[PDB]
Design an enzyme around this catalytic site. Structure first.
Site, PDB file in Angstrom:
ATOM      1  N   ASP A  43     -12.124  -4.301  -5.006  1.00 53.70           N
ATOM      2  CA  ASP A  43     -13.337  -3.536  -4.619  1.00 53.70           C
ATOM      3  C   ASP A  43     -14.482  -4.268  -5.304  1.00 53.70           C
ATOM      4  O   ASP A  43     -15.675  -3.699  -5.047  1.00 53.70           O
ATOM      5  CB  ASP A  43     -13.076  -2.223  -4.659  1.00 53.70           C
ATOM      6  CG  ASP A  43     -13.113  -1.503  -6.407  1.00 53.70           C
ATOM      7  OD1 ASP A  43     -12.982  -2.613  -7.075  1.00 53.70           O
ATOM      8  OD2 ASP A  43     -13.343  -0.478  -6.592  1.00 53.70           O
ATOM      9  N   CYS A  46     -12.644  -4.453 -10.280  1.00 55.95           N
ATOM     10  CA  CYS A  46     -11.190  -4.566 -10.739  1.00 55.95           C
ATOM     11  C   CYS A  46     -11.209  -4.983 -12.219  1.00 55.95           C
ATOM     12  O   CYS A  46     -10.085  -4.636 -12.835  1.00 55.95           O
ATOM     13  CB  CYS A  46     -10.276  -5.231  -9.786  1.00 55.95           C
ATOM     14  SG  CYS A  46      -9.859  -6.866  -9.782  1.00 55.95           S
ATOM     15  N   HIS A 219      -9.137 -11.837  -8.293  1.00 52.28           N
ATOM     16  CA  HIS A 219      -8.655 -10.386  -8.549  1.00 52.28           C
ATOM     17  C   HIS A 219      -7.760 -10.425  -9.845  1.00 52.28           C
ATOM     18  O   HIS A 219      -7.104 -11.337 -10.291  1.00 52.28           O
ATOM     19  CB  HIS A 219      -7.722 -10.366  -7.438  1.00 52.28           C
ATOM     20  CG  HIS A 219      -7.309  -8.923  -7.360  1.00 52.28           C
ATOM     21  ND1 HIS A 219      -6.174  -8.340  -7.997  1.00 52.28           N
ATOM     22  CD2 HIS A 219      -7.862  -7.619  -6.899  1.00 52.28           C
ATOM     23  CE1 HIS A 219      -5.972  -7.221  -7.703  1.00 52.28           C
ATOM     24  NE2 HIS A 219      -6.956  -6.722  -7.167  1.00 52.28           N
TER      25      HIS A 219
END
Ligand SMILES: *CC(=O)NNC(=O)C[C@@H]1CCS(=O)(=O)C1
EC number: 3.4.19.12
Length: 225
Positions: A43, A46, A219
């Site tokens: 989002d 992270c 990520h």
């Protein structure tokens, strides 16, 4: 468990890139050094969410390490004030972070810490605190960040646009700054789709890590040695 998952076997993430030769090779290599993984929600928050959860989890049951970490956290309002943040505007975020450190001390379970980091309200308060501390620490050491990272960058603008706001993605500077601000040693493993070696970096260079993260899509997921 929508923000931070339960622990899974490392090879369970093969299914995220099926029939991808290079990803399969690098994940098989990673499974030789690490046993388990937690996934985090992608989002834009992270990095902060994963480092906060994994570091606090590493403190559970360690009475001297908890005492020393609480002592540092109690001084962090002074960092924020020295950088120009106002107490009435950071109070709610500081209070949320101090509360979860006291939970580590008083409760001491994985279950209770994971419930706070999956509570959208508590967890996003914690993330906003970590983002303000990261910004404060960069602003108070602007000459260091210009000397060693980038002599041409605009430090105040960078903090305003790429550190303080929720959902803004991180680079090397934010990782280095939050590591230094809280004395957290972390190792990041890099998995990309180039036919290259699986490699890692330790923050800071010399240290024994307490936290391991897997970086792939802009990520960060949490690894267990
Ligand atoms: C650490 C973090 O929250 N990372 N963000 C994401 O994983 C976002 C994804 C990567 C590219 S995207 O924004 O299209 C989905």
């Amino acid at each position: 468990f929508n923000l931070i998952s339960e622990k899974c076997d490392i090879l369970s993430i093969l299914r995220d890139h099926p029939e991808n030769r290079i990803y399969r090779r690098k994940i098989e290599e990673l499974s030789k050094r690490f046993t388990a993984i937690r996934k985090t929600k992608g989002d834009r928050n992270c990095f902060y969410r994963a480092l906060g959860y994994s570091y606090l989890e590493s403190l559970l049951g360690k009475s001297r390490e908890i005492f020393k970490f609480k002592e540092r956290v109690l001084q962090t309002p002074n960092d924020l004030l020295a950088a120009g943040f106002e107490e009435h505007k950071f109070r709610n975020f500081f209070n949320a972070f101090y509360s979860v450190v006291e939970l580590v001390e008083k409760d001491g379970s994985v279950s209770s810490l994971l419930k706070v980091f999956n509570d959208q309200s508590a967890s996003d308060h914690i993330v906003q605190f970590l983002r303000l501390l990261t910004s404060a620490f960069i602003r108070n050491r602007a000459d260091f960040f210009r000397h060693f990272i980038d002599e041409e960058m605009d430090i105040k603008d960078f903090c305003t646009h790429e550190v303080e706001p929720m959902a803004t993605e991180c680079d090397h500077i934010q990782i280095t700054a939050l590591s230094q601000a809280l004395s957290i040693a972390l190792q990041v493993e890099y998995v990309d789709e180039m036919d290259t070696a699986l490699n890692h970096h330790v923050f800071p260079e010399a240290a024994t890590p307490s936290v391991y993260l897997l970086y792939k899509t802009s990520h960060y997921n949490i690894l267990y040695a």
